[PDB]
Amino acid sequence: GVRTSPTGEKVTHTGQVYDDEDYRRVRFVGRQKEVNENFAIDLIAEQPVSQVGSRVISCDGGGGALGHPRVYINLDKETKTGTCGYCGLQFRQQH
Amino acid sequence: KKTTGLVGLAVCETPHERLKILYTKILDVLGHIPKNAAYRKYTEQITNEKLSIVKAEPDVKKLEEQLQGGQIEEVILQAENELSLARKMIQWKPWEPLVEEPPASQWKWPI
Amino acid sequence: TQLITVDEKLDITTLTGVPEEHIKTRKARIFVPARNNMQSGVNNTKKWKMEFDTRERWENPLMGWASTADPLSNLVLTFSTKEDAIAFAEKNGWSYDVEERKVPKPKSKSYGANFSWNKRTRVSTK
Amino acid sequence: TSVKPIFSRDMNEAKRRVRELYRAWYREVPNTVHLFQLDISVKQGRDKVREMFKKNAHVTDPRVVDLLVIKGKMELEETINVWKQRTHVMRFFHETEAPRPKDFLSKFYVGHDP
Amino acid sequence: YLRVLFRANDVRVGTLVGEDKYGNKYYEDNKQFFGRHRWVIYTTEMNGKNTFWDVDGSMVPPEWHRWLHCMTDDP
Amino acid sequence: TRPTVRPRNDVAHKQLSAFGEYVAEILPKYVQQVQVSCFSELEICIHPDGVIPVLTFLRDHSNAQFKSLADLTAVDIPTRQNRFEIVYNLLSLRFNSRIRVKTYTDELTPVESSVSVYKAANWYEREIWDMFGVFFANHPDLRRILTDYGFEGHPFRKDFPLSGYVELRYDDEVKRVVAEPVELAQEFRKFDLNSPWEAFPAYRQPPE
Amino acid sequence: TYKYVNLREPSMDMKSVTDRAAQTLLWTELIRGLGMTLSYLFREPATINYPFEKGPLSPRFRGEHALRRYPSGEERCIACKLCEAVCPAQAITIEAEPRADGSRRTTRYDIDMTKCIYCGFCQEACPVDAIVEGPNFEFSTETHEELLYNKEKLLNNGDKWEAEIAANIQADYLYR
Amino acid sequence: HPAAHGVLRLVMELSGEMVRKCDPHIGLLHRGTEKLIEYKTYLQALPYFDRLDYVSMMCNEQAYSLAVEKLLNIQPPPRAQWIRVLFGEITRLLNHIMAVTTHALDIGAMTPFFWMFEEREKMFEFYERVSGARMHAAYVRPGGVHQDLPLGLMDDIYEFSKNFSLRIDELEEMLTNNRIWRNRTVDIGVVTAEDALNYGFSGVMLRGSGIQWDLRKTQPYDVYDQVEFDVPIGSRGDCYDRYLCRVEEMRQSIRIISQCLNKMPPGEIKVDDAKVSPPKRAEMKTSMESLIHHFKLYTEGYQVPPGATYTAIEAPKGEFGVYLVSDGSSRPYRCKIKAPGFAHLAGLDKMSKGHMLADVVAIIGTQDIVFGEVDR
Amino acid sequence: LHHAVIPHGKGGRSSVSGIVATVFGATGFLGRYLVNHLGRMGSQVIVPYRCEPYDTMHLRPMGDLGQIIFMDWNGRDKDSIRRAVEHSNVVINLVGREWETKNFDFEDVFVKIPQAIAQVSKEAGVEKFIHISHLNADIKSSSKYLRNKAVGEKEVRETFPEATIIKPADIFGREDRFLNYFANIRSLGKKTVKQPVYIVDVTKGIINAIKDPDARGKTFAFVGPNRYLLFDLVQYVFAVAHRPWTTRDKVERIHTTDRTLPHLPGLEDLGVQATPLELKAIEVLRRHRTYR
Amino acid sequence: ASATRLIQGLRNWASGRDLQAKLQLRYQEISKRTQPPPKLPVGPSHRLSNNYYCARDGRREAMPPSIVMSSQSEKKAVSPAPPIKRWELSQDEPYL
Ligand SMILES: NC(=O)C1=CN([C@@H]2O[C@H](COP(=O)(O)OP(=O)(O)OC[C@H]3O[C@@H](n4cnc5c(N)ncnc54)[C@H](OP(=O)(O)O)[C@@H]3O)[C@@H](O)[C@H]2O)C=CC1
Ligand code: SF4
Ligand code: SF4
Ligand SMILES: [Zn+2]
């Protein structure tokens, strides 16, 4: 979702939203400052982190050649979830 | 004959004697050239070999067959241009010793 | 035909037509691009690079790109020696600053020197 | 460095060929400035011609002086023909400023400059 | 009929594959050549821009864009 | 080996070595190097005082026709006493063979402009005059080709940079096109692509 | 093997010369040319009517330069810069930043559409198929500013269709 | 000017409608391609050889890829050789039909333009279906053809070859022994074969005027040694005969395409060397060495041994030459292009000495000048 | 001054100078050449228009990549003017139609337009608001044009008193109006002294006034050094031309005067070289058939 | 198809080309798109146990150039390449 800058407009997902005396605002006159209201971080919070019974597991991303190459992550520490570098979704183990 | 191939090519009535007197002028102008240069050696060898091919040729089509580099007035043009360079090769004296040195690492390529 | 020689430099600096500020003010630098230390290997050595001083790159006022007023910013002249570098620099016109070539000093090293009964080199973990 | 010559054996024919070039440029101005329909007096164009000759005072070698005469003769060919245009002749002029300074104070305020 | 008489030219309804939201109509034939298999009829005021006249490309949704540029064989 | 490696020739390599040795013997006056690479195309490398004699001898002498010309290029290399390299490239009609005729020169000493034996080289010589500066004595017309009229510099040099010293735009102040010092809109971010670890060990020059 | 043409003498038979004279007087094969013109006159044209009957295409067509994201997930790009390394006109401008969690992502992603030459080298080099050549071609702009794209423009351009791009990749993934 | 096919400034200093001199000024379309390839790498600068000659979209790609292979001592697999020869003849057909079409526009001849550009629209649909490009298909990586043809191509090539034989017979019906087109263009453009040698002419000029010379049947640089055809040679000058030469090269190109569909083996796409060609998707997503080779092959490019090579192909305009100079490096040092358009343009004044300006337009028409290729 | 407002690099073509210009008018003559010199300088120009977009497309190729920007307004509203002057470093006021339309008189354009825009300019906190005015705009009679511009001078001096009022004489250029009417012929004898001023020295004085402070408050004048008679100028313009919606306020203007005022500084005090009318008159005296 | 027989007779009457047969209207001769996907195999490699890169390393076999003469009674004078014999006339209809 979009936040509220003191300009009364839509901020960006990365912090480049304008100051109150930027004339780039006054070259945004009368047209859409377009923004993708879906943000990247807003989907990770709704991810069910799965529970695989092995120790060091695999990740492909739903079929080879549609996604990312085989990355292998570890489930040693129970204080930190195993985060993929490509997928951006975590993994856990149980025993 | 009639309806020859190339555009700038109109053969004469008696090709063999024209080609022979061309090659005798080749041997003559080569006779002006000194002996120890290899130019005389290789040109006199190749022209006496081609003339010795031609001396046993009664037919024009047979000479176009056996002599390689045909057909007829391409051979004549080859002869005329060889005569012109021989006349130029009296000049320029191109059998001198080697002209002076390169930088001697100029042709070392990968720099 | 054996014309006269003179003890002079060469003067193509008005034959090539480059503007005068880019003639005079561009203080060149001749240097050896040394070993990229995060890599290994000196294959990228042995080539004297003549390059030029850098100037400003400002924000493009629409995209934040680095728009420059520099023709002579991206040149790299690849040489093999130093005398020919000086000759080319005197030939085309500008001035220059010179780095040396700093080869690695070879040092005596041995695994039988890594181990010793009465010297204080002790890996203690291998 | 017993270099092959170009046109001249010393500076004498170099000066003779460049003064013949300047003679041709003096008698070359009025025809072109009447033909090409310019906005500039004949004397101003002739003064930029003699100014462009004044720019090259440090040129010494006979090869280089002859090569400048070759460039000038090629350009006089391309201007006695209408291969070139009004744009090129007005590009010899420097009228649309560009008033770019030289004072260190004005190289300092309008700065990031030597 | 004046709808299609001054829309462009056609009278060739008779295959009736279907329609889609924004109301737009899609007709696939096999009787003609390759190039007039699949044709489209644009509706009126699909987003309030009075699109009976001055019709635009890409007023179609993208699944019919893939279907209609002859990349597939089924709607 | 038997697939995926381009097979070399033997007898054609032998014949081109024999022919290069032949030319090198029968012209002692203008010969420095003859060489054959792996893909068997002959190379002759020449001092720049016998250019028209070598081209007349390589047009005729009847055991080398070589009637087709290519490219002339004086390929620019720094660091040398003689930068510029005239590269002729000749094809024969009766023979099916290829020779390269590379003579060398520096920035100012002209060569004899071999247009009088090959009429193809006229526009080639004018073009390489416009782009390099290898002046051509005994030549009818040296104009400028592939360049602007008011532009100069011989821009295929390694001194002239990628973008030019000139820029054109339009103004309505004087209703015409004017020139400016150049103003790029992007950096042209140059990519460092010089890999370590001895890309080809067979081409190691003796280290200084 | 050569087949050289235009070699004939004109046949001097009486029948041949009267047929050629009738050809000269009546302009006969000129009328044969008119017959060919009528034979194409009485065909039916293979045109398409433009907004209503669009021309065909190919599955590997390269248009819009969109971006994909993960199946129920976030941005597929990593900012690995291979697309700048292979983009020949250097239209790819990428300045990355890692995000607020730590995984490496972007800030400044720019495809200069005025400079793009539509090869597909960024389609080849992209190790996750993040950047994809789009299917359609309507840029068609009354301005210059609207040509140059940014990250949110390209992601809105990738949110206008996904199953389009997924269908084309599922058609094309075995070949490339 | 619309008869100036492309752009060609031409200062004709004439006597009135019957000339004195003409000078082709070219370089108006100058783009700096040699300097750009000096500041680029190989794979990144292959679209310059897409865009240089903008008619032979596959022939010059074949020329540059075979230049790199002849430099690099690598044989491609034979299936890629057959497909490359197939598309070489296909693009040869497109170039000959553009030559006939632009001569038709330069001479009048309004409708065969439209007929044969409907056929060339079918050609462009073939390029779309193969490479995904409209008119500039890269498609020929150095190291064999990448991203090969799907199922559904050879059927269309077969049926289009039958239809095209019918259409070239219909073009011979409409034009080709027409009365006044012939009386318009026979007696013009005669160049002596001695000077056709020594003006540097090549290809179709040396076809139509005299000499018998084909790079294909004299020099095997691809699978041309296994296919059989014949090539027309000129009677004596006479631009009409040059037109007949173009038409018979078209029909024999159709015969070569029929033979090539008869002799297509289903072996492999690319070479057996991952350090030359990038690997495919499954190896890219699974195996380590494929990803390392992918990554360094698309950052740096494969290293190339130093060499100053040249090769030339029989492009439909003539001896298309590419001259590479490669340091032991990943960027080639200096490359140059021998343009048959440049060579055929060199003899323009001598072709148009003693004629009128209408023949000057027809001599621009008799040689398919494009001037992207002439520019270097 | 905010960041990325600071000047950068050599001049022109992405030289982000210390001005952000907002120009009113500029669809006509003098404002278009002013935007021409601003795009030569390389700043961002906000310009509105109520006209057909042809002239604003015509001045599109002036600035750099996406620099200049266009909007809309009218002589009725306040919101669009405020939207124009939302974020403006410098702002100039050129306005005025030289004939009466059916809804805009000579009245109330110079009265109603500079009041609202200069008031919201002061209410936007801008610096160096510049407003044009004709020379000798007097309350004295026989000049509706000059008396309305004098009322405009009074209003601009009333609200935001330290605005730069600029008064040149008549302006000869490339698309001049009064010299076109001089050329617009086909018997009358009169006299009145007059001296004009050239357009590019005027606009160089404008940009020196807009980026050189110590200039505010006090009004400036820009007159060429000619100082001769109307009859000599008619002889001059017809000797160079080689010939043997209009009101009579035009003829009142060209028979008024050109008198000087020594209270205020001019060309040399502001520091731009004055060019006479000779070769620029040779430029602008075309259309003749075969003497060139 | 979809034409009357009278205009078909006129099309044959205009020229003997049989325009009904091949007509430049591709109807269903195009293969029906979206077939089941075909696999793309690998040729003379990817078998294990033998395929060394030490063997087929044609890239690393680029030889340095071999040289003859420099600055550093003979029955001879061969050609660079053998004189290729003159070609053959056409089988199917040359002129003549
Ligand atoms: N020498 C001097 O000192 C002189 C100075 N001037 C002044 O200099 C400027 C340029 O001179 P000039 O050539 O005569 O005129 P111009 O045509 O160049 O400029 C007049 C401008 O005023 C605009 N304008 C006028 N009335 C309205 C309105 N009701 N609504 C919107 N826009 C309006 C016009 O817009 P549009 O065209 O789009 O309708 C136009 O942009 C003017 O401001 C004028 O007052 C004029 C004459 C002499
Ligand atoms: S190649 Fe793909 S993953 Fe890499 S930076 Fe470009 S878009 Fe991102
Ligand atoms: S298609 Fe080509 S030019 Fe376009 S972004 Fe990709 S690599 Fe760059
Ligand atoms: Zn993963």
mmCIF file of N, CA and C in Angstrom, chain F residues 1 4-5 12 15-22 24-25 31-37 63 66 94-97 199-200 202-203, chain J residues 44 55-72 74 76-86:
data_model
loop_
_atom_site.group_PDB
_atom_site.id
_atom_site.type_symbol
_atom_site.label_atom_id
_atom_site.label_comp_id
_atom_site.label_asym_id
_atom_site.label_seq_id
_atom_site.Cartn_x
_atom_site.Cartn_y
_atom_site.Cartn_z
ATOM 1 N N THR F 1 38.021 -33.296 -32.353
ATOM 2 C CA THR F 1 39.132 -33.795 -33.152
ATOM 3 C C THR F 1 38.662 -34.150 -34.555
ATOM 4 N N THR F 4 34.001 -31.252 -34.749
ATOM 5 C CA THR F 4 34.076 -30.014 -33.961
ATOM 6 C C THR F 4 35.423 -29.291 -33.958
ATOM 7 N N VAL F 5 36.409 -29.787 -34.693
ATOM 8 C CA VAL F 5 37.657 -29.075 -34.924
ATOM 9 C C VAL F 5 37.780 -28.885 -36.425
ATOM 10 N N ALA F 12 47.631 -27.491 -50.059
ATOM 11 C CA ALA F 12 47.451 -26.071 -50.336
ATOM 12 C C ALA F 12 48.391 -25.222 -49.491
ATOM 13 N N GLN F 15 51.750 -25.506 -51.163
ATOM 14 C CA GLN F 15 51.838 -24.721 -52.388
ATOM 15 C C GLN F 15 51.924 -23.233 -52.091
ATOM 16 N N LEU F 16 51.201 -22.759 -51.074
ATOM 17 C CA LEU F 16 51.313 -21.348 -50.720
ATOM 18 C C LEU F 16 52.650 -21.025 -50.071
ATOM 19 N N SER F 17 53.229 -21.959 -49.306
ATOM 20 C CA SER F 17 54.582 -21.748 -48.796
ATOM 21 C C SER F 17 55.593 -21.707 -49.935
ATOM 22 N N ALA F 18 55.418 -22.584 -50.926
ATOM 23 C CA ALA F 18 56.300 -22.593 -52.086
ATOM 24 C C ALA F 18 56.155 -21.316 -52.896
ATOM 25 N N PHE F 19 54.930 -20.812 -53.027
ATOM 26 C CA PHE F 19 54.709 -19.615 -53.828
ATOM 27 C C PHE F 19 55.212 -18.366 -53.121
ATOM 28 N N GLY F 20 55.053 -18.307 -51.800
ATOM 29 C CA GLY F 20 55.617 -17.198 -51.055
ATOM 30 C C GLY F 20 57.131 -17.197 -51.092
ATOM 31 N N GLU F 21 57.742 -18.382 -50.984
ATOM 32 C CA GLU F 21 59.189 -18.492 -51.117
ATOM 33 C C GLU F 21 59.638 -18.112 -52.526
ATOM 34 N N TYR F 22 58.828 -18.459 -53.531
ATOM 35 C CA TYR F 22 59.073 -18.086 -54.923
ATOM 36 C C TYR F 22 59.116 -16.576 -55.100
ATOM 37 N N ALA F 24 59.467 -14.317 -52.753
ATOM 38 C CA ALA F 24 60.500 -13.745 -51.900
ATOM 39 C C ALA F 24 61.886 -13.899 -52.510
ATOM 40 N N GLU F 25 62.118 -14.991 -53.238
ATOM 41 C CA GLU F 25 63.372 -15.121 -53.967
ATOM 42 C C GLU F 25 63.426 -14.159 -55.144
ATOM 43 N N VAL F 31 61.310 -7.256 -50.016
ATOM 44 C CA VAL F 31 60.853 -8.412 -49.244
ATOM 45 C C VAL F 31 61.451 -8.311 -47.849
ATOM 46 N N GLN F 32 60.582 -8.375 -46.855
ATOM 47 C CA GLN F 32 60.819 -8.463 -45.431
ATOM 48 C C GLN F 32 60.163 -9.701 -44.855
ATOM 49 N N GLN F 33 58.871 -9.908 -45.049
ATOM 50 C CA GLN F 33 58.361 -11.125 -44.438
ATOM 51 C C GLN F 33 57.351 -11.810 -45.340
ATOM 52 N N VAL F 34 57.387 -13.142 -45.379
ATOM 53 C CA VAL F 34 56.300 -13.909 -45.960
ATOM 54 C C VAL F 34 55.857 -14.895 -44.897
ATOM 55 N N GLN F 35 54.552 -15.034 -44.703
ATOM 56 C CA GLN F 35 54.110 -15.956 -43.669
ATOM 57 C C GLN F 35 52.756 -16.549 -44.010
ATOM 58 N N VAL F 36 52.550 -17.763 -43.516
ATOM 59 C CA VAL F 36 51.296 -18.483 -43.663
ATOM 60 C C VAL F 36 50.807 -18.841 -42.271
ATOM 61 N N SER F 37 49.535 -18.561 -42.007
ATOM 62 C CA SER F 37 48.892 -18.945 -40.764
ATOM 63 C C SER F 37 48.291 -20.340 -40.922
ATOM 64 N N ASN F 63 52.189 -16.580 -63.950
ATOM 65 C CA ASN F 63 51.991 -17.624 -62.961
ATOM 66 C C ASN F 63 51.371 -17.035 -61.703
ATOM 67 N N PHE F 66 45.960 -12.707 -60.222
ATOM 68 C CA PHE F 66 45.480 -11.878 -59.101
ATOM 69 C C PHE F 66 44.868 -10.559 -59.584
ATOM 70 N N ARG F 94 41.923 -17.240 -62.330
ATOM 71 C CA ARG F 94 42.266 -18.541 -62.884
ATOM 72 C C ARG F 94 42.798 -19.508 -61.839
ATOM 73 N N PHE F 95 43.019 -19.055 -60.606
ATOM 74 C CA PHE F 95 43.797 -19.829 -59.650
ATOM 75 C C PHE F 95 43.054 -20.308 -58.417
ATOM 76 N N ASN F 96 42.086 -19.546 -57.892
ATOM 77 C CA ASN F 96 41.466 -19.757 -56.576
ATOM 78 C C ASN F 96 42.526 -19.739 -55.469
ATOM 79 N N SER F 97 43.119 -18.562 -55.286
ATOM 80 C CA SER F 97 44.077 -18.362 -54.209
ATOM 81 C C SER F 97 43.930 -16.952 -53.658
ATOM 82 N N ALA F 199 45.387 -16.362 -21.283
ATOM 83 C CA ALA F 199 44.368 -16.762 -22.255
ATOM 84 C C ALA F 199 44.916 -17.653 -23.370
ATOM 85 N N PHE F 200 46.119 -17.366 -23.864
ATOM 86 C CA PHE F 200 46.711 -18.247 -24.865
ATOM 87 C C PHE F 200 48.202 -18.415 -24.617
ATOM 88 N N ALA F 202 50.432 -20.146 -26.192
ATOM 89 C CA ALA F 202 51.283 -20.357 -27.353
ATOM 90 C C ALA F 202 51.832 -19.061 -27.926
ATOM 91 N N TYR F 203 51.241 -17.922 -27.585
ATOM 92 C CA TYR F 203 51.603 -16.634 -28.160
ATOM 93 C C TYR F 203 52.364 -15.764 -27.165
ATOM 94 N N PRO J 44 27.102 -35.211 -30.597
ATOM 95 C CA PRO J 44 28.357 -35.908 -30.266
ATOM 96 C C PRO J 44 29.070 -35.404 -29.018
ATOM 97 N N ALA J 55 41.080 -33.346 -25.222
ATOM 98 C CA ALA J 55 41.160 -33.890 -26.571
ATOM 99 C C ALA J 55 40.705 -32.874 -27.613
ATOM 100 N N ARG J 56 39.457 -32.431 -27.529
ATOM 101 C CA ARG J 56 38.859 -31.639 -28.601
ATOM 102 C C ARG J 56 39.017 -30.135 -28.381
ATOM 103 N N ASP J 57 40.230 -29.716 -28.034
ATOM 104 C CA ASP J 57 40.481 -28.318 -27.693
ATOM 105 C C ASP J 57 41.075 -27.592 -28.899
ATOM 106 N N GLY J 58 40.247 -27.466 -29.938
ATOM 107 C CA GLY J 58 40.675 -26.805 -31.158
ATOM 108 C C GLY J 58 40.892 -25.317 -31.004
ATOM 109 N N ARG J 59 40.314 -24.715 -29.966
ATOM 110 C CA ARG J 59 40.563 -23.310 -29.669
ATOM 111 C C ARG J 59 42.005 -23.078 -29.240
ATOM 112 N N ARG J 60 42.562 -23.990 -28.449
ATOM 113 C CA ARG J 60 43.909 -23.838 -27.921
ATOM 114 C C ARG J 60 44.966 -24.408 -28.845
ATOM 115 N N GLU J 61 44.612 -24.728 -30.087
ATOM 116 C CA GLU J 61 45.571 -25.235 -31.059
ATOM 117 C C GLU J 61 45.858 -24.231 -32.164
ATOM 118 N N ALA J 62 45.531 -22.961 -31.943
ATOM 119 C CA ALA J 62 45.803 -21.911 -32.919
ATOM 120 C C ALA J 62 47.305 -21.688 -32.988
ATOM 121 N N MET J 63 47.905 -22.109 -34.094
ATOM 122 C CA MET J 63 49.350 -22.138 -34.214
ATOM 123 C C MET J 63 49.891 -20.736 -34.503
ATOM 124 N N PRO J 64 51.118 -20.440 -34.073
ATOM 125 C CA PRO J 64 51.758 -19.182 -34.468
ATOM 126 C C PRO J 64 52.101 -19.203 -35.945
ATOM 127 N N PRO J 65 52.203 -18.039 -36.594
ATOM 128 C CA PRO J 65 52.370 -18.026 -38.055
ATOM 129 C C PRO J 65 53.758 -18.493 -38.474
ATOM 130 N N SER J 66 53.796 -19.347 -39.493
ATOM 131 C CA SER J 66 55.058 -19.871 -39.996
ATOM 132 C C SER J 66 55.616 -18.941 -41.059
ATOM 133 N N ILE J 67 56.920 -18.693 -40.997
ATOM 134 C CA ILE J 67 57.537 -17.625 -41.772
ATOM 135 C C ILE J 67 58.543 -18.198 -42.758
ATOM 136 N N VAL J 68 58.673 -17.515 -43.893
ATOM 137 C CA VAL J 68 59.802 -17.580 -44.811
ATOM 138 C C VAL J 68 60.151 -16.137 -45.161
ATOM 139 N N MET J 69 61.071 -15.962 -46.116
ATOM 140 C CA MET J 69 62.056 -14.880 -46.239
ATOM 141 C C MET J 69 61.601 -13.457 -45.914
ATOM 142 N N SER J 70 62.564 -12.640 -45.495
ATOM 143 C CA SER J 70 62.494 -11.709 -44.381
ATOM 144 C C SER J 70 63.270 -10.429 -44.664
ATOM 145 N N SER J 71 63.727 -9.820 -43.572
ATOM 146 C CA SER J 71 64.990 -9.102 -43.503
ATOM 147 C C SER J 71 66.013 -9.849 -42.668
ATOM 148 N N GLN J 72 65.546 -10.596 -41.669
ATOM 149 C CA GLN J 72 66.370 -11.442 -40.814
ATOM 150 C C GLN J 72 67.003 -12.588 -41.603
ATOM 151 N N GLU J 74 66.859 -24.503 -62.173
ATOM 152 C CA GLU J 74 65.765 -24.834 -61.265
ATOM 153 C C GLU J 74 64.510 -25.118 -62.074
ATOM 154 N N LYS J 76 61.131 -25.358 -61.752
ATOM 155 C CA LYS J 76 60.334 -24.811 -60.659
ATOM 156 C C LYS J 76 59.251 -23.897 -61.226
ATOM 157 N N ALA J 77 58.821 -22.907 -60.426
ATOM 158 C CA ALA J 77 57.738 -21.945 -60.670
ATOM 159 C C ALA J 77 56.359 -22.585 -60.735
ATOM 160 N N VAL J 78 55.926 -23.152 -59.612
ATOM 161 C CA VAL J 78 54.559 -23.624 -59.436
ATOM 162 C C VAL J 78 53.618 -22.448 -59.216
ATOM 163 N N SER J 79 52.328 -22.714 -59.293
ATOM 164 C CA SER J 79 51.240 -21.789 -59.032
ATOM 165 C C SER J 79 50.887 -21.816 -57.552
ATOM 166 N N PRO J 80 50.201 -20.782 -57.039
ATOM 167 C CA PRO J 80 49.705 -20.865 -55.654
ATOM 168 C C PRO J 80 48.703 -21.981 -55.449
ATOM 169 N N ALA J 81 47.877 -22.245 -56.451
ATOM 170 C CA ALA J 81 46.839 -23.258 -56.385
ATOM 171 C C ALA J 81 46.689 -23.818 -57.787
ATOM 172 N N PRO J 82 46.256 -25.074 -57.936
ATOM 173 C CA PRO J 82 46.207 -25.690 -59.270
ATOM 174 C C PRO J 82 45.183 -25.014 -60.163
ATOM 175 N N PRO J 83 45.481 -24.886 -61.464
ATOM 176 C CA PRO J 83 44.520 -24.283 -62.394
ATOM 177 C C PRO J 83 43.284 -25.142 -62.552
ATOM 178 N N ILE J 84 42.159 -24.663 -62.021
ATOM 179 C CA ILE J 84 40.927 -25.437 -62.053
ATOM 180 C C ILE J 84 40.387 -25.453 -63.473
ATOM 181 N N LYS J 85 40.025 -26.645 -63.943
ATOM 182 C CA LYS J 85 39.589 -26.841 -65.315
ATOM 183 C C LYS J 85 38.254 -26.140 -65.552
ATOM 184 N N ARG J 86 38.067 -25.674 -66.790
ATOM 185 C CA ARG J 86 36.886 -24.921 -67.191
ATOM 186 C C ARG J 86 35.625 -25.760 -67.009
#
